[PDB]
Amino acid sequence: MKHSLPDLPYDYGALEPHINAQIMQLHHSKHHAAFVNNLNVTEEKYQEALAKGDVTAQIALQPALKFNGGGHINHSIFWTNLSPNGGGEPKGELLEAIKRDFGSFDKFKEKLTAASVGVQGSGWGWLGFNKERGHLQIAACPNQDPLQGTTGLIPLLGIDVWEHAYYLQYKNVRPDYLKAIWNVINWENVTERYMACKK
Amino acid sequence: MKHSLPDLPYDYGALEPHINAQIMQLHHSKHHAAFVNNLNVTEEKYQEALAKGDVTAQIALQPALKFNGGGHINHSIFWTNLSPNGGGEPKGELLEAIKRDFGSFDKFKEKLTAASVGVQGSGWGWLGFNKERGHLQIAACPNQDPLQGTTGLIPLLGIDVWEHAYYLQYKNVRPDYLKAIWNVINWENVTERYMACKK
Numbered sequence: 491m492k493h494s495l496p497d498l499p500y501d502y503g504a505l506e507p508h509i510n511a512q513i514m515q516l517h518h519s520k521h522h523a524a525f526v527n528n529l530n531v532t533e534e535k536y537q538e539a540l541a542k543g544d545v546t547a548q549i550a551l552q553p554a555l556k557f558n559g560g561g562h563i564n565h566s567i568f569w570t571n572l573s574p575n576g577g578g579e580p581k582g583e584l585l586e587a588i589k590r591d592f593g594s595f596d597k598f599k600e601k602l603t604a605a606s607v608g609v610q611g612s613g614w615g616w617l618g619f620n621k622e623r624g625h626l627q628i629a630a631c632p633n634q635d636p637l638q639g640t641t642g643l644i645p646l647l648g649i650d651v652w653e654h655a656y657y658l659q660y661k662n663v664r665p666d667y668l669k670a671i672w673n674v675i676n677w678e679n680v681t682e683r684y685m686a687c688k689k
Numbered sequence: 690m691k692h693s694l695p696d697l698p699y700d701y702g703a704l705e706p707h708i709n710a711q712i713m714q715l716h717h718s719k720h721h722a723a724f725v726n727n728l729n730v731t732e733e734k735y736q737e738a739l740a741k742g743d744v745t746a747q748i749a750l751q752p753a754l755k756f757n758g759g760g761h762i763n764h765s766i767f768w769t770n771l772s773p774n775g776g777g778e779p780k781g782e783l784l785e786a787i788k789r790d791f792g793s794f795d796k797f798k799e800k801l802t803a804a805s806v807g808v809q810g811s812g813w814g815w816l817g818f819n820k821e822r823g824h825l826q827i828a829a830c831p832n833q834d835p836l837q838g839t840t841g842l843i844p845l846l847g848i849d850v851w852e853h854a855y856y857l858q859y860k861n862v863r864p865d866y867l868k869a870i871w872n873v874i875n876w877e878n879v880t881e882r883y884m885a886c887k888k
């Protein structure tokens with residue numbers, strides 16, 4: 491099957507001034523690319539280990555698969571969660587669910603901002619949908635550990651709090667990056683992911 | 690290639706009074722049996738997930754693969770690490786290496802006992818060989834995480850401090866179990882594993 495780097499849905503500068511073109515080009519063409527090439531190499535090594543029944547090799551390969559595999563899963567979602575036409579607030583059933591589960595859109599923003607700022611080290615913040623409980627849920631993931639693979643929650647909106655996503659523009663001030671990114675959230679995509687969870 | 694439950698190399702009662710027949714039969718015919726079978730189920734799933742390129746499914750299967758795969762790796766070694774012909778002290782180059790790297794055989798016993806008592810929760814203690822440094826090394830692993838797959842060290846002697854290995858006989862007093870097991874260590878097997886590392 492072989493994983494492939496998806497095209498970005500917009501120009502590298504489409505999210506200016508909130509995320510500059512240099513970050514988008516680096517974050518997409520270098521970081522994400524590395525997560526795909528090394529993921530493909532690791533998957534191929536696993537195929538060899540499985541055919542030989544080498545369980546030691548399978549277990550030794552798990553960290554590279556989760557790190558590079560999670561990186562591929564996460565970034566692919568992140569690009570679609572943003573848009574030059576984004577920002578503002580969602581509408582319809584998604585906004586109703588946000589108000590029901592978090593009180594209000596503003597309170598939801600505070601909680602997701604807090605979870606994203608609260609990641610110590612590298613990782614991600616996610617708004618997800620809990621299919622079994624039938625409601626929204628916020629979770630944090632370290633490094634590149636993907637939400638669904640490690641928690642079962644279906645990802646709706648991810649924020650890449652890695653330093654390579656903002657450090658060139660905002661330096662150490664991650665909160666300024668988190669505030670700015672709300673202006674480019676593609677709520678149309680987040681809604682599609684939400685409606686896909688429900689029948 | 691399908692993994693198979695190995696026969697025990699001795700009678701269930703061959704290690705009495707140090708480890709009773711009820712433990713050997715349970716620890717082998719129930720616990721290990723579950724690991725091997727569940728490992729095969731997980732491998733078949735992971736093969737299916739790998740062929741589809743489903744990285745989320747692969748990552749969700751990692752805990753079962755490490756737990757059951759490690760269980761198969763560890764226990765298969767553990768049975769060979771014990772023998773009715775065991776006990777006493779090793780000889781030859783392995784004894785020389787123990788004295789060189791740990792000071793004395795008694796000092797090695799103290800270090801491995803300390804590592805085994807020090808496991809908080811379920812896990813194992815291992816004497817291994819570091820191929821890159823060319824010397825022995827003691828390490829502890831949680832749950833069923835295997836030594837080589839998680840550390841690169843080649844396993845020589847493993848001690849199962851899991852509560853299901855001694856609780857029927859020694860209850861909470863793990864040190865009594867650790868004291869007894871030294872009488873049945875198959876140093877011939879440990880020597881073979883050590884000599885297999887050197888060429």
Ligand SMILES: [Mn+2]
Pocket residue numbers: 517521565650652654655
């Ligand atoms: Mn990233």
Ligand SMILES: [Mn+2]
Pocket residue numbers: 716720764849851853854
């Ligand atoms: Mn056991």
